[PDB]
């Protein structure tokens, strides 16, 4: 139903694009691009079409597009850890 994917910061970029966010018909962001050479692509495990439920355990429910993108960018840039955990689904979660 849902998968926790740990992306190690193996490259200088994360290399994903997301669409949607709160107050749209795609209320949780969906991954639309995974760029070769970036940390996400290097990880084996994210897919175009994955919906991001949580970033490092923080729900994205309620976060409009720009804010969801800001949180993900901060999770990548922070020196708090050398990885980002994405909770994702290919379908829907109850």
């Amino acid at each position: 139903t849902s998968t926790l994917v740990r992306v190690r910061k193996s490259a200088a970029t994360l290399g994903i694009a997301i669409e949607g966010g709160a107050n749209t018909r795609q209320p949780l962001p969906r991954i639309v691009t995974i760029q070769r050479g970036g940390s996400a692509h290097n990880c084996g495990q994210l897919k175009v079409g994955h919906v991001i439920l949580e970033v490092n355990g923080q729900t994205l429910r309620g976060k409009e597009h720009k804010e969801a993108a800001r949180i993900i960018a901060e999770a990548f840039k922070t020196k708090e850890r050398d990885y980002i955990d994405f909770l994702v689904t290919e379908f829907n979660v109850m």
């Binding site: 970029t13 994360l14 290399g15 994903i16 694009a17 997301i18 669409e19 949607g20 966010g21 749209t24 018909r25 795609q26 639309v32 691009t33 760029q35 970036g38 597009h65 720009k66 993108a69 800001r70 993900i72 960018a73 990548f76």
Partner: peptide, 11 residues
Amino acid sequence: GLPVTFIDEVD
């Protein structure tokens, strides 16, 4: 359309 952001381009 849905908004799209490339995370690496976030300022």
